Ligand binder design. Structure first.
Ligand SMILES: [Mg+2]
Ligand SMILES: [Zn+2]
Ligand SMILES: [Zn+2]
Lengths: 47, 278, 1339
């Protein structure tokens, strides 16, 4: 749930026969970033 | 702790203004025509008590209280710049037409979420007024075909004009007594969003280009030239035949022969085209 | 990847880097065509294209060029996902102030600008002026101006007076803040003012002004000029049926600002007067204010409606009630719910699944098997094969169901056993076939319940679901050592009838060769199911590790008991099946079978025990009828006798010799005493309801009634429910709080009356009202414990320290409640336990205690052992594996990475829905007398009077401590001496509970000094000389002269010399309290031990939730501050003053005691810091400060578990002490040098600084700390992360503090990775975070 590229790439792994389990990114957090940056408060990823 | 407000602070600021008499406005308007810095300040500040009563007349409209008073002030600045003191017109009567003109323009351009042109928004003003009188005259609901007969208009014209006002509502506002879920969680997309539908179009594209490379050699370049499945651009029969085959009927004879061959491949492979298209 | 999510300020130069275009036109879509326009809120040039690989005008639409810009329309071709990433910006002509830093509770601008809260809005609204950079002038920047003040100051000074008003004035003050020089003024004026209110406001300013220097955020960035916009996909414009669109309310707020921002630029380009400019700037402030938040002061109303518009900040608060989308319910795929159904033909590790559900859940798995086999060529042809229901799709479907553990869960999940993995079996029907034994863990009955399913896709999830989530692994409950897979009511019924004793039966007296001869003789119809026979079996004992001996024993048991031993494996003796096999008797057999055999042979034994329980339950057709409810014939004798006794009480009340309050209590106890006689006569008839004969006249045995078998076996119901069917129901109390006097004499068999049934509706309706509310109170208790215990995952194997509390069994009352074998079951030993002898050691290293060492302690007389508990650990940010116990679903020790903080909070909140004189003491078990911490004086007559209230008279057994232990009050009479013989039923102590005696120091005469005849002392007598003593006067009824006077009876010798007590310099003079009477007159010899004066004197969820909150009660208990002599101060000031005069060091201050409550403290008595002074409950804060840190954990365990003990649930002590570790984490400071005076710092931060200052330049820099107690709600607010703190707390309160501080927060913990979406370090994810931290600037 809450993905765009992760769900499509996972469905191909089930048909191929090997479960790669790609990481992806949840869509519930990508929306929260765009809503926070639009309020005048900064948020970034230091990594 | 004092009272903090927006409409109350502006009403007290305009109260400390001098009175405008008829024997003084004739001299102020005469000096403003020649061009002076003090002429525009004293003439615009003396008429601030007039736009507050005109903007308050259009209550219960799309614009708020501060939106009507501020927009009406732009018409007063333009009125004192185009006034003709030699014509003998009144300074207060000439500015009344400019204050009322700027108010009606902001309603037809800022109330609705979709800006409508001016030459088409005036046709809807007389349609709403004609439907208001016909509502209480017939003691029934305003029908779409009933206004067409009263205003002498076709049924196809009133259906599109009365249907132009969509009256869009909010989405986050939920319906019902309990607000358990909004309308954001009830909408769906029109394109293919399911993972199964996105995989069928990708697997079929990788098989169509693969079946053409294994079908034949001379017939493969003819189907790729007619239909750009390998990234090529689509061309007509006369454009494709001018550079290959040098004829208009030689490129079509091979097309039907290769079409019957691919028809037998999809039948024995298990595609079952007779059941899909039915 | 990414890590260390930080929060800072949005700089105006950085906002322009995020945006790609400037939004200037408010219109979005054309009227005729449905296409966006340039420079709009939905434009394609700024945000991106609408369709996939297509521009607006349609010039470039090929799929070849990935990135290109069209010459006609300036739009870059891309996918449809780019429209959610790119943002815009609106460049305002005039700056606007942010509202998050203005209307919040902490005014970030008020303390920084040294202004008031109301002054910030006074300048922004163009009401009052303010001068900046005055220099050498009379006014400064701190002073305010007005309409008449600004005009007079301009003509007075003229120069060096720069005054501004509006948003530009605050922006000018925030620009030239000079934070490098402003910090020097705060560090010099802090110790100058000694006022507490002045040093608190100055400490908050330095805490925030220093955050802007280290984080790099300038104070001028709080105000903004250009603001970003939301992507157009988050506020979409999707059409509906009929050509009607749907606009989001967030787009209306953005369109209102652009309509006013463009008017500001047009008005400022024509030399407009300053009066009209302030009107527009005030409208722009309200527009931006209504765009961020809404509903506080603005409350913007939309068109054709009345509800306020939800803004951006309101969208986060409105998202599932001030929470995140990840913390709320999320819709997941590969799931499905249906009605459950019991299946007796399934194994313990597998379950049932319909054929129609398996085709939809495993749909992607069928497409992969058909392509690899060769039947389906493409994926489109395989879709028409699973929807056609062919005969070859079922053979390939069962290939992926063989090994694929699916998940099962119910709607309410209150423990870890609610989600278990099973192996699905293809069954026909539309219901989930569930195992009968597993229903005890789900706590679900078969009445229409629905259980959802889950299918793991990744093979990594299939391995952790088979080894951890399997139903065969979680055979033991996580709460205690009792197994959760126990035979239920239906299985225990067939096993109880199989193991039964009978006097006469068919085939009794014969012998058999082995167990093979018993089964053949029974199924042949020639032998009864239970007959006294004798058999010889070949049993194997597993007492030796790795060796299985064989022994033959000829035992004489029943026929059914020999058949049950066939299911029992060869690792248990035959004595375990010789009982009646009740429910509580079989729960200990599985717990013993799993401990001495293993897990592989226990699952097979649990399945064969269920198979033999259902097969033998159908053979015995047990049924309940009207003849099974045996009504006792003597029941009518008790009712007719009690009916004549109540009429005698009513005949007396008619006259008036007895009051109403006396007759009410004298009749409500008669029916309670008569209810015992009815139940005693029923159990004596129901148990002996069998008459048999075997070569004799009469012989009695156990009854074979159907009602007795369903009550003695504990299958369904208890002994309290059988009394409602056989005997009377009792006194049905009203829900108002009072008990109804009229009882219900009739039972369920004889039928209730009309008025008797209406009374039963009162208690039945009140029970259903508390059941629905029990799910909200117990659900709220488990929601606060998991939020404080979310970061307590085990990370270390062993600390290396020896710090633990003592463990002693419950010796309260007459007998013991919980022995030492249950409290020290599965815990490591802290120190080396010593033998009760001279000098011998048992545990040389102090390792863990298994089930073998439990019985080993029963051989010796050891009673006091110390164990390492998690409340006294030494690790940092975690809990060691050695300090934690071993009570888990498995039998071995804990693992490195198991989240013990979550499994301990669920074990407490799960059973929450099941929750709601002494004058002379005697002994029960004879033994010796063992005194501890008590001092008394022996009298010449034989009595013993103790002047201490902390004396505990404990009874000792012949080998050590007995099961009896009592407490001795102050001034009690103990005729028995310490260290005597045993005495059963004797009296060892006697005292008065109402009259409080006063102890005497020595003998001799007494002289009353300080007595005022009329103000302090008043000689009063009774009728006919009834009471003739020296009665003192009250403190309020005294005169003005005797208001502060207090008498004190001095004790001296008879010869005339002053006598004093040894130890103290001042004599021991007894004071005269109020309403006191002296038994002996002044000048008479009084012996020791005589009374000097006579001073006469709720449970369930609200009790457990109050102890975890550590809330101060209404009437706390006042304890002593230090040991020493106690005395009274001045009582004329309206309150009592209590001072302590120790022998080593006294104290200048004295505690004040109020006059509202009583005071049991006596003057001249050696008080201690242990016992209490005032009666009533004791506050938990006084135990940690005065008694210790190890005593607080003992008080909570002995109080929280006592609430769960009244119901019968068993919760281990390792889960209660686990939550106590988090509440005792933060500590206080009492010495400066490194931080402020009063600051709440964690113990992990103080220990890393105390040990560092010992090895450095200055060793005196280290300061001491003191432990403080915090509630479960207060300790949860100390989260260093902001994503885990914004879940339960306010969103605008955590984000505002995290912005002005600039704290770069990492993703360490468990609640942080759930919202983000990364792996969880608890469990199998510990190896992932270990490799990530290792390869990070370490090598
Ligand atoms: Mg149910
Ligand atoms: Zn274009
Ligand atoms: Zn530890």
């Amino acid at each position: 749930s809450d993905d765009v590229n992760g769900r499509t790439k996972m469905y191909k792994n089930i048909v191929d026969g090997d479960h790669r389990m790609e990481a992806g990114m949840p869509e519930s957090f990508n929306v929260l970033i765009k809503e926070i940056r639009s309020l005048g408060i900064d948020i970034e990823l230091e990594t | 702790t004092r009272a903090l407000d927006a409409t109350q602070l502006y009403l007290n600021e305009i109260g400390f203004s001098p009175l405008l008499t008829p024997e003084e406005e004739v001299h102020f308007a005469r000096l403003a025509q020649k061009g002076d810095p003090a002429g525009r300040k004293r003439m615009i500040e003396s008429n601030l008590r007039l736009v507050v009563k005109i903007a308050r007349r259009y209550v219960n409209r799309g614009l708020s209280l501060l939106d009507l008073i501020e927009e009406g002030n732009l018409g007063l600045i333009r009125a004192v710049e185009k006034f003709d003191p030699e014509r003998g017109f009144r300074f207060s009567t000439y500015a009344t037409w400019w204050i009322r003109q700027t108010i009606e323009r902001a309603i037809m351009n800022q109330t609705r979420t979709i800006r409508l042109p001016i030459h088409v928004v005036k046709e809807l003003n007389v349609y709403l007024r004609a439907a208001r009188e016909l509502t209480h005259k017939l003691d029934h609901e305003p029908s779409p075909e009933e206004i067409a007969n009263l205003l002498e208009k076709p049924v196809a014209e009133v259906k599109r004009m009365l249907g132009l006002n969509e009256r869009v509502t909010s989405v986050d506002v939920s319906l019902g007594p309990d607000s358990d879920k909004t309308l954001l969680d009830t909408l769906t997309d029109d394109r293919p969003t399911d993972p199964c539908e996105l995989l069928q179009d990708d697997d079929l594209s990788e098989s169509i280009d693969q079946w053409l490379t294994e079908l034949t050699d001379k017939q493969r370049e003819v189907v790729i030239r007619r239909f750009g499945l390998r990234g090529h651009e689509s061309s007509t029969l006369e454009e494709v035949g001018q550079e290959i085959g040098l004829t208009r009927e030689r490129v079509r004879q091979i097309q039907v022969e290769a079409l019957k061959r691919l028809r037998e491949i999809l039948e024995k492979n298990g595609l079952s085209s007779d059941a899909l298209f039915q | 990847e990414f890590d260390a999510i930080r929060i800072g300020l949005a700089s105006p130069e950085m906002i322009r880097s995020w945006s790609f275009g400037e939004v200037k036109k408010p219109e979005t879509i054309n009227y005729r065509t449905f296409k966006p326009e340039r420079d709009g809120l939905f434009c394609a040039k700024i945000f991106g294209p609408v369709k996939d690989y297509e521009c607006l005008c349609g010039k470039y639409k090929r799929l070849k060029h990935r990135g290109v810009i069209c010459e006609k329309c300036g739009v870059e071709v891309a996918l449809a996902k780019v429209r959610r990433e790119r943002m815009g910006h609106i460049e305002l002509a005039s700056p606007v102030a942010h509202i998050w830093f203005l209307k919040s509770l902490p005014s970030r601008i008020g303390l920084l600008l040294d202004m008031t809260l109301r002054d910030i809005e006074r300048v922004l609204y163009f009401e009052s002026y303010v001068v900046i950079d005055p220099g050498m002038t009379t006014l400064e920047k701190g002073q305010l101006l007005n309409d008449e003040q600004y005009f007079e100051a301009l003509e007075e000074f003229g120069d060096d007076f720069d005054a501004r008003m509006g948003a530009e004035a605050v922006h000018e003050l925030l620009n030239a803040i000079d934070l490098e020089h402003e910090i020097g003024r705060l560090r010099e004026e802090i110790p100058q003012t000694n006022s507490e209110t002045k040093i608190k406001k100055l400490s908050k300013r330095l805490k925030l002004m220093e955050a802007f220097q280290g984080s790099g955020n300038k104070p001028e960035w709080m105000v903004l000029t250009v603001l970003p916009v939301l992507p157009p996909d988050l506020r979409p414009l999707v059409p509906l049926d009929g050509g009607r669109f749907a606009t989001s309310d967030l787009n209306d707020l953005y369109r209102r600002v652009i309509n006013r921002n463009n008017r500001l630029k047009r008005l400022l380009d024509l030399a407009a007067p300053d009066i009209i400019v302030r009107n527009e700037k005030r409208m722009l402030q309200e527009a931006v204010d209504a765009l961020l938040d809404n509903g506080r002061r603005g409350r913007a109303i939309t068109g054709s409606n009345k509800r306020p518009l939800k803004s951006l900040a309101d969208m986060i608060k409105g998202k599932q009630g001030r929470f995140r989308q990840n913390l709320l319910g999320k819709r997941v795929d590969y799931s499905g719910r249906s009605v459950i159904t019991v299946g007796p033909t399934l194994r313990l590790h597998q379950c049932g699944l319909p054929k129609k559900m398996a085709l939809e859940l495993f749909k992607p798995f069928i497409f992969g098997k058909l392509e690899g086999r060769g039947m389906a060529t493409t994926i489109k042809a395989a879709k028409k094969m699973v929807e056609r229901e062919l005969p070859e799709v079922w053979d390939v479907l069962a290939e992926v169901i063989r090994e694929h553990p699916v998940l099962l869960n119910r709607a309410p999940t209150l423990h870890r056993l609610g989600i278990q993995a099973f192996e699905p079996v293809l069954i026909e029907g539309k219901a989930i076939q569930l195992h009968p034994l597993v229903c005890a863990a789900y706590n679900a009955d078969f009445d229409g319940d629905q259980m959802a399913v889950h299918v793991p896709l990744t093979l990594e999830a299939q391995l952790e679901a088979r080894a951890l989530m399997m139903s065969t692994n979680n055979i033991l409950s996580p709460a205690n050592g009792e197994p959760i897979i126990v035979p239920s009511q239906d299985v225990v019924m067939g096993l109880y009838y199989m193991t039964r004793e009978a006097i006469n039966a068919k085939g009794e007296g014969m012998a058999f060769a082995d167990l093979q001869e018993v089964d053949r003789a029974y199924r042949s119809g020639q032998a009864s199911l239970h007959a006294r026979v004798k058999v010889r079996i070949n049993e194997k004992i597993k007492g030796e590790d790795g060796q299985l001996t064989a022994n033959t024993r000829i035992v004489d048991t029943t026929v059914g008991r020999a058949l049950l031993f066939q299911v029992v494996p060869a690792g248990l003796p035959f004595d375990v099946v010789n009982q009646s096999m009740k429910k509580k008797a079989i729960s200990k057999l599985i717990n013993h079978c799993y401990r001495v055999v293993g897990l592989k042979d226990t699952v097979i034994f649990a399945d064969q025990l269920m198979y033999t329980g259902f097969a033998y339950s159908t053979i015995s057709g047990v049924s309940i009828g009207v003849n099974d409810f045996v009504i006792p014939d003597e029941k009518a004798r008790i009712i007719n006798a009690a009916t004549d006794e109540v009429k005698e009480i009513e005949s007396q009340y008619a006259s008036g010799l007895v009051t109403q309050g006396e007759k009410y209590n004298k009749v409500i106890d008669l029916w309670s005493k008569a209810n015992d006689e009815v139940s005693k006569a029923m159990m004596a008839n129901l148990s002996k309801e069998k008459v048999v004969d075997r070569e004799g006249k009469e012989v009695d045995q156990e009854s074979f009634n159907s009602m007795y078998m369903m009550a003695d076996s504990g299958a369904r119901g208890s002994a309290a429910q059988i009394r409602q069917l056989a005997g009377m129901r009792g006194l049905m109390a009203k829900p108002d709080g009072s008990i109804i006097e009229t009882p219900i004499t009739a039972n369920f068999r004889e039928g209730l009356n009309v008025l008797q049934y209406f009374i039963s509706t009162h208690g039945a309706r009140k029970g259903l009202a508390d059941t629905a509310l029990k799910t909200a109170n117990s659900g709220y208790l488990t929601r606060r414990l998991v939020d404080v215990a979310q970061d307590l995952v085990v990370t270390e194997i062993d600390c290396g320290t020896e710090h633990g509390l003592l463990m002693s069994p419950h010796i309260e009352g007459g007998d013991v409640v919980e022995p030492l074998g249950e409290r020290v079951l599965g815990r490591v030993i802290a120190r080396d336990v010593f033998k009760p002898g001279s000098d011998e050691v048992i545990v040389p290293a102090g390792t863990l205690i298994d089930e073998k060492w439990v019985d080993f302690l029963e051989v010796m007389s050891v009673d006091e052992v110390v164990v390492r508990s998690p409340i006294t650990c030494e690790t940092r940010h975690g809990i060691c594996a050695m300090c934690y116990g071993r009570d888990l679903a498995r039998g071995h020790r804990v693992n490195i990475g198991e989240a013990v903080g979550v499994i301990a909070a669920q074990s407490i909140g799960e059973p929450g829905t099941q929750l709601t004189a002494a004058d002379n003491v005697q002994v029960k078990n004879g033994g010796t007398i063992r005194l501890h911490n008590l001092k008394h004086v022996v009298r010449a007559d034989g009595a013993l009077v103790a002047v201490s209230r902390s004396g505990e008279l404990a009874v000792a057994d012949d080998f050590g401590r007995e099961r009896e232990r009592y407490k001795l009050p102050y001034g009690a009479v103990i005729s028995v001496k310490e260290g005597d013989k045993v005495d059963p039923g004797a009296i060892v102590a006697k005292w008065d509970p109402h009259t409080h005696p006063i102890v005497t120091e020595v003998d001799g005469t007494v002289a009353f000094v300080g007595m005022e005849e009329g103000i302090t002392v008043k000689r009063q007598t009774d009728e006919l000389t009834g009471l003739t003593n020296i009665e003192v006067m009250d403190p309020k009824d005294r005169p003005a002269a005797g208001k502060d006077i207090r008498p004190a009876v001095k004790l001296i010798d008879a010869a005339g010399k002053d006598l004093l007590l040894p130890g103290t310099d001042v004599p021991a003079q007894y004071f005269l309290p109020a309403n006191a009477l002296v038994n002996l007159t002044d000048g008479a010899k009084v012996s020791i031990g005589d009374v000097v004066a006579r001073i006469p004197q709720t449970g369930g969820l609200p009790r457990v939730a109050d102890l975890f909150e550590a809330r101060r009660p209404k009437e706390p208990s006042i304890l002593a501050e230090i040991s020493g002599t106690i005395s009274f101060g001045k009582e004329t000031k309206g309150k009592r003053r209590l001072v302590i005069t120790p022998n080593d060091g006294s104290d200048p201050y004295e505690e004040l005691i109020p006059k509202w409550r009583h005071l049991n403290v006596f003057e001249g008595e050696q008080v201690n810091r242990g016992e209490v002074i005032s009666d009533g409950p004791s506050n938990p804060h006084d135990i940690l400060r005065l008694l210790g840190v190890s005593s607080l954990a003992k008080y909570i365990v002995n109080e929280i578990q006592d609430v769960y003990r009244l119901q019968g649930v068993k919760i281990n002590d390792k889960h209660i002490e686990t939550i106590l570790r988090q509440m005792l984490r933060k500590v206080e400071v009492s010495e400066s040098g490194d931080s402020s005076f009063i600051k709440g710092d964690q113990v992990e931060l103080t220990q890393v600084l105390e040990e560092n200052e010992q090895l450095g330049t200055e060793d005196k820099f280290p300061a001491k700390y003191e432990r403080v107690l915090l509630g479960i709600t207060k300790a949860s607010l100390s989260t260093e992360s902001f994503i885990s703190a914004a879940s339960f707390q306010e969103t605008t309160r955590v984000l505002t503090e995290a912005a002005v501080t600039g704290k770069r927060d990492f993703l360490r913990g468990l609640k942080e990775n759930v919202v983000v979406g990364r792996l969880i370090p608890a469990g199998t994810g510990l190896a992932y975070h270990s490799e990530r931290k290792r390869q990070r600037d370490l090598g």
